[PDB]
Subunit: 439 residues, 4 copies
């Protein structure tokens, strides 16, 4: 079968190695119990990441047969840009959105790392994701899509691992007993996943709905909720050329990675894009997270402002509906499934291709900003857009008569069958349901 | 025919009378040219409205045969609450939404005023909406839905009116020549429509995309963009019972109108809910508006936060999709059409009925706020929600294999037909379209 | 845990007993190995069902502690009618649809049988569905929805059962060894599931795409594909009152069960509604089935013909879109989930409530029929429906100019960015994709 | 303005000339009153069309300054194929669909004829469509999309035309008085529009819902409802290669026009695809039509059978939903608008590109046929598709528990708020609405 319930002693095993305590201990344990682990680390432009070069070294020190560092930034940013172009975000609360940053990270990490392993000829793959979350499944699909022959081994799916190093304490103590002094004395009030597109905070104290963004130490921006933190208003311009972000505050860039890093700094100085979401997982249940994605948020606002001045109503509606559906597929680890590709490609080609122009914003604190100017050769919006006469409007209005008549007829029918208390004849038609009541 | 192209001399004519220069002059002119005008004014809880009682008096002074003041606040608020329960808003830019406040006002005004006129037996109806906008059509549909026998007369559809009193200057001069000293010396940088649910600002200087919220003097809140305006952070609680807003900051209310007035004050102190939208009209073209809806915004945020912790993914998705569609129908003057009623009723019954709970927010400036607590007997979200084992997850994952296999097969097929440069085998599948490029 | 991997020796176990070899052997085996099985059989109006009264008797003979026969026909038909009113069907090929008859049967069977067991105080539940199909999951959800305390035991989930009585031969031989002479000498070219709403045929020879309806012996109708079978044309009338089917060929009925039985006879004489579908299961993979549902098909055609003459475009579109989504949820065993109830209730209230009228058809062979008359007090369709003038049309057309202009502009932009070879200026705009080619 | 209310005496005027009495008389009248008419006729492969070469001759005889015959068959068939690939059909009744054949004809006719006129430098355009239908608007949009400078003149928009030649009798008498003996002694029981993709029949006696297909003399097939007409069963094969129809009954073709002509003959011998629809027009009201499209129907059935065996559930669902929306836009004369192109292109690229294979059918009378075989290198369907174990299924089922629990909770809540009479605890949950009742 594909999933190996227990350590395949003597076999080469590849593992997505982040350098954290989970994968550090798992690799040492895997080597200790007889397997031949290979470490694969992805450079994802993690905001707080000290030195990526060191991660492969610790893997070697802990027993990796070989350890590679794969740069995934170009690909991550390209997918992030695609997400922006498609409005591929679905978890929203009052207008604040989660920019699907971890899902984007897994789509690029889960495929590129497995591709890299093909050069080492290793055919057993795994990671350190818990068996209770979304990530173990995202990696699972992405990996098997990239390598069909792949077999799967994950410490959190092996009862022999969980019983021995199940707790963080057991993992620290294991490192110790193996001759390695690890440094995890610190246990925050939440766990953090991050990459160049954003940072996600959840678990521990964030599991409680009475906790708030106040306990979070943002790593991509400032604590805008802290009135003692100085944040001067800032004017910023964002310019797109055929759906592609090409300039921020008049500056252009050598590549998209640099552009995104700058979008992050700009939004970061204000705390732009931070949100608190209760969301539905891929599996049963719900989870709660607090997210950061300053650059994605900045690009998203400008892109949509331009979209509203360039495309027609039906096209804008498809962008919203298709974008939300795509956002869900991305979240489920299905970013490359046929239904996702179809929506993504269609939005990139017919919507994003016309998004050329520049938007000027004034950023203050958090999600408080104002739009100061919107410019584009492709606007269909025109001031004071003469074109038709009052007689023309008389004609148009008159041709609504039969539709109005039919609707009036339906109101009468709904009133008769009890769905409306009173039709339109006596004023406001009243829908007959529990919500039709005051306080 | 239904629409009378010219003044029906000698006939009773009802007119939606707001007291502005347009309807003041139109009624005087209608009486002057031989018609018998009746004025009907709606009390919509207009924020800046001096004294509604005076409007019917001026109508009488200008020639109205009779003048009535109809209170439409209870109905307006009830529809506003329904809108909140259904997320019936569709014009959004980066998460900021227009709360369809004018459309809600017209649905209640256009039906109630025509119903009232039935007591006076007047069968010719009109208003002072321009022939180039959305409102002339909203009033048209709502009126004909309420009274089938209705004939229609609108000064802005009568070439004899426009040629004589077409300009604001011609209207002031007309009042003057008729013995009335009007007071419109002031001509703002934009026009304003408002009611208890919100205020809309457009036209004139707002027609230009380089104008901003900075030229607007908000009438439902403060100028949060003005760093010189003091706005202390404020903690607020919003509580719902079966989809109905029943308490703000622990206070309950005698009726919904009072509740809404308080929601407005709370959001108003911060400038919550203000947005700048470029939108598609009912007819051809686009328009640009800057909107206020502090109470609607406050209720909307709390309602959706609760929704995310109470309902499942598919239900939340229907709320978004059906709400957006309903928002469009509301905007088009179709709030009581069968397709609208079906979506509204279904969301009120199955979604709103379970929205019971309380949300605590910390409001700062504009749309910058934080969520501090979310509580509800109906939450399906539970901290640390054991329930399944790693072996169970092995089973679940394994049963995805054939779907992954099929998707892998499609990637190969798309690569072969040229839609993807490279499948998943070599890393990240690359979609073949213009957007797949850097800067 | 909820699912017991092995026989709970000594415990009361309820089982959905159909009387087939699977459940006959499973109950005998369960009793033989020490459990205390209780049989629960549902009367579903199975077309070919000999005598339902005998099924509980054989259960007793094989070892059941107690055996009950629950009549589920009224409920089955009521849900079938709801399905018709909502167009809750999603598996279609060229217009021919699967009427979700097994899914409807499981929704009523899985809830009613578990409810019945509550009177016997039995808290372990199961059925004889294979672990590779949809039904084991439909029963699972429906059962747990009805009884939260329920524990689950299913022979096809017990490795101790499958290894002993895995094959049909092993089951026959087991009956024999236990002193019972069963009669299953016959093994068709496919398996059959049926109830009063329809019959489904799949597995065995139907697994092959080169097999056809030709190997099926229909149990609810005739072999219309057999030119040697005489099938005279027949005129039939179907009449609805507020969405409810109340008369067939002028005859009314004492209850819906009788009405459905007659719809079945009428459609049955022609083979109406039979289809061949390749469909996606709840889990991974696809299956192939050949279906019968003569009465459902007859009611479905008349209902939709009426719908098209009574409701407006947007309402009809919601019926199609919401009906398809509901059809999928019904198929997945989610007929009572909140997202399903919302769609079902909304369609019953706003669409079905107005479906009053009568349709006359001429039925020939299979799906070949003609519509001969459509009548309804609620039609909005009117012959030769004067109402507007050519001048009015000039106005309406003129007001499309700006939208046409904007679209023309987009064509130019798509041509420039390479999406169209040539805009509209040179004739037919050419979309740039692989499909734009001849043979 | 764009639309000229009266004959532009002395100016060159182009007119879509079909050769019927309407355009024959209009061109003679236009020339007689002083305009300089140019005739443009489209070769659309009309089934009953005698000799297209003669149409330009009669135009010349009646006064045309110049008369051209433009071949539009290749383009018409290419768009028809695109429609099939996208399932761009929306008017359906019980599974029978209108294949949008007139809308496809107008999209190609309205653009190509106007493009052709650019060579003659004529800038006034029109046609003979009535001011009360869909076509006058389809031609209007398509024409203005192709030529922005275009001015519009249509006899049915000119009160001076309608008053003089309003009736068919007045038109015959006009020809006569001008020295031309026309031949329209025959006035059928309905009017007919047709092209190579299909024939539409409406108006006159078809306006009555008690008329039926029985009064129609089909021009693309036989009277399958007439039991006296011999129609032997026929086996047919349809083969696609990358979404393109390439062989019928083993025969390939030099071009698509020939392929379509053959599809028509095959379906024609059986009357395949004929339907009776009540539909909503672009404007207010409904109309009734009886349609023929034998080849389109044949290709449509095979294409969808293949689609069901090749693509996954979500992709198939998008094909249905996007296809229906596209069908509506096509019907509205918006086949080249951005929202249409986006849906069409996305379906052609990601769905149609994989549709490779062959389907064998047995055609009998009308829409009575059977599927005999389905073959494809791209099928994801596999007979007897081992892959997972009962233990794996135990895991999968177990992971549904929390979702079931949440749904059970909602049932309890809906029961409490009165939406359900009884939850699931007592059997079948009962939705509280008018439809929950028997006969
Ligand atoms: N940069 C990276 N390169 C490779 N794999 C990574 C990277 N970041 C995360 N992963 C993989 O994703 C898994 C889930 O990420 P997460 O940050 O939640 O890890 P974790 O379970 O806390 O483990 P650790 O304590 O080792 O970080 C990790 O166990 C690891 O296998
Ligand atoms: N409170 C109200 N009661 C009745 N009718 C109203 C009310 N508010 C607005 N209307 C109607 O709606 C029309 C459009 O509103 P809007 O505020 O844009 O008016 P307007 O065209 O500027 O006219 P005026 O200058 O008279 O306000 C008004 O002409 C009037 O007929
Ligand atoms: N009328 C019924 N009453 C109760 N349970 C039923 C009924 N019909 C079917 N079932 C249940 O549904 C399961 C699946 O139905 P299906 O007809 O496929 O059965 P099966 O696996 O072939 O078993 P059998 O050989 O016993 O019919 C059956 O095993 C049985 O538990
Ligand atoms: N083959 C064609 N070539 C050019 N224009 C055409 C063609 N077929 C139809 N039309 C145009 O479409 C209009 C509407 O088509 P329809 O067949 O309904 O015509 P009609 O109004 O009955 O006129 P006629 O009596 O001249 O056919 C025609 O008046 C004509 O202008
Ligand atoms: N260890 C992990 O990487 N966790 C799996 C991702 C799931 C995510 N934390 C969630 O439950 O929302
Ligand atoms: N583990 C984390 O802290 N975050 C990773 C998952 C975040 C988010 N719920 C997601 O699944 O995308
Ligand atoms: N006079 C009015 O009331 N104007 C019509 C409403 C239309 C709105 N101002 C718009 O054009 O967006
Ligand atoms: N005239 C205004 O200032 N506002 C009224 C219309 C506002 C908004 N565009 C609407 O149509 O609802
Ligand atoms: N034994 C069964 O009842 N089978 C489970 C239902 C699944 C259905 N036969 C299918 O696989 O399509
Ligand atoms: N087992 C059968 O013969 N039919 C039952 C399932 C039929 C259909 N595929 C369904 O799952 O509803
Ligand atoms: N003369 C025409 O070509 N008629 C306009 C097309 C409209 C179509 N007959 C309809 O009303 O459905
Ligand atoms: N005029 C006809 O006989 N048919 C042309 C229109 C047919 C169909 N209602 C359509 O508008 O496409």
């Amino acid at each position: 079968t594909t999933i190996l319930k227990h350590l395949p002693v003597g076999q080469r095993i590849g593992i997505a190695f982040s350098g954290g305590l989970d994968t550090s201990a798992a690799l040492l344990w895997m080597r200790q119990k007889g397997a031949v682990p290979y470490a694969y680390t992805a450079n994802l432009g993690q905001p707080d990441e000290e030195d990526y070069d060191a991660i492969p070294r610790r893997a070697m020190e802990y027993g990796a047969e070989n350890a590679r560092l794969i740069d995934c930034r170009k690909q991550l940013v390209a997918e992030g840009i695609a997400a922006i172009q498609c409005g591929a975000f679905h978890n929203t609360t009052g207008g604040l959105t989660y920019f699907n940053t971890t899902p984007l990270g897994r789509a690029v990490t889960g495929t590129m790392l497995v591709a890299a392993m093909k050069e080492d000829g290793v055919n057993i793959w795994g990671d350190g994701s818990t068996y209770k979350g979304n990530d173990i499944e995202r990696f699972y699909r992405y990996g098997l899509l990239t390598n069909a022959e792949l077999q799967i081994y994950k410490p959190w799916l092996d009862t022999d691992f969980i019983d021995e190093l199940g707790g963080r304490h057991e993992m620290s103590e294991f490192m110790i007993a193996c001759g390695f002094d690890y440094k995890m004395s610190v246990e925050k009030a939440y766990s953090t996943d991050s990459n160049m597109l954003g940072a996600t905070h959840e678990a521990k104290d964030l599991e409680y709905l009475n906790s708030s963004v106040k306990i979070v130490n943002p790593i991509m921006g400032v604590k805008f909720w802290d009135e003692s933190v100085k944040i001067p208003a800032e004017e910023v311009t964002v310019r797109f050329e055929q759906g592609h972000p090409v300039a921020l505050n008049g500056k252009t860039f050598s590549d998209d990675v640099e552009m995104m890093l700058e979008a992050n700094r700009i939004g970061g100085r204000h705390g732009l894009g931070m949100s608190d979401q209760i969301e539905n997982r891929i599996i049963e249940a719900k989870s709660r997270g607090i997210y950061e994605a300053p650059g994605m948020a900045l690009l998203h606002i400008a892109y949509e402002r331009l979209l509203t001045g360039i495309h027609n109503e039906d096209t804008i509606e498809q962008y919203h509906a298709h974008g939300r559906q795509l956002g869900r597929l991305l979240y489920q680890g299905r970013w490359f499934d046929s239904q996702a590709l179809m929506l993504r490609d269609s939005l990139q080609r017919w919507v994003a291709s016309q998004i050329t122009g520049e938007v000027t914003l004034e950023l203050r604190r958090g999600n408080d900003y104002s739009i100061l100017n919107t410019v584009s050769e492709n606007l269909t919006y025109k001031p004071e857009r003469s074109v038709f006469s009052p007689d023309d409007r008389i004609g148009q209005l008159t041709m609504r008569n039969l539709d109005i008549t039919d609707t009036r007829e339906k109101l009468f029918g709904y009133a008769k069958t009890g769905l409306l208390s009173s039709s339109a004849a006596s004023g406001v038609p009243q829908v007959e349901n529990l919500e039709n009541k005051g306080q």
